[PDB]
């Protein structure tokens, strides 16, 4: 049985390996695609320049991008905080980890339960 | 997502080269991009308060206690009890419809 599941596991490793390379060829073909957007946006700029005046608000969309970036840094720092909290993780912390697992199970359980109630109401 | 979005932007930038206009899309796009970061901001602040309470305990933390287990046990008992009550409402509604 170990050899059986080993054949399955090697199949899984191979297939996920191939799928990651497919995502990578996507990440590349998409860089190529994002580049034509850049050259054509350059064309649009060199055309809109061939007009009178009056560019639009850029100092606002740039601020939106900056808000996105600051939120990204916040999420990264939250990842760091979670990593350090784990780095801090006696019978005590075992009790805490187990209680957290149990509570998470209760949460997903109530989620499935509400899903059932809503399916019934739609029923 | 990201690939096809770069694709759509490039396609719209291509059609403009001859003569076109595809702009409402990026408008809704910036709209959703802001709506996304919205919840993440509240997340940043909630994590702020979480780290705050954690370190508040950590300055107090030079000791441990045995009662929190019993407290969490009775609370999780009432909790799963409420959860099973909800699941019972769900099974009973399923049965009401499947009897209808």
């Amino acid at each position: 049985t170990l050899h059986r599941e080993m054949e399955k596991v090697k199949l899984d490793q191979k297939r996920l390996d191939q799928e990651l390379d497919f995502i990578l060829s996507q990440q590349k073909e998409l860089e190529d695609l994002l580049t034509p957007l850049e050259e054509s946006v350059k064309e649009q700029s060199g055309t809109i320049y061939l007009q009178h005046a009056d560019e639009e608000r850029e100092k606002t969309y740039k601020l939106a991008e900056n808000i996105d970036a600051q939120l990204k840094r916040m999420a990264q720092d939250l990842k760091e905080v979670i990593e350090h909290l784990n780095t801090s993780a006696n019978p005590l912390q075992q009790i805490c980890k187990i209680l957290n697992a149990h509570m998470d199970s209760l949460q997903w359980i109530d989620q499935n339960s509400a899903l059932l109630q809503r399916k019934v109401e739609q029923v | 997502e990201e690939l096809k979005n770069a694709e759509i932007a490039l396609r719209t930038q291509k059609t403009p080269p001859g003569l076109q206009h595809e702009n409402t899309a990026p408008a809704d796009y910036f709209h959703t991009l802001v709506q996304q970061f919205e919840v993440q901001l509240q997340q940043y602040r909630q994590q702020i308060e979480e780290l705050e309470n954690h370190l508040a305990t950590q300055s107090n933390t030079l000791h441990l206690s045995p009662q929190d287990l019993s407290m969490a046990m009775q609370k999780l008992y009432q909790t799963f009890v409420a959860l099973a009550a909800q699941l019972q409402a769900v099974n009973e509604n399923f049965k009401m419809l499947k009897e209808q």
Partner: peptide
């Protein structure tokens, strides 16, 4: 500890 902080908060809430 993040889930555990959340769950302490929740069981306290109930």
């Amino acid at each position: 500890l993040q889930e555990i902080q959340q769950a302490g908060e929740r069981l306290r809430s109930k």
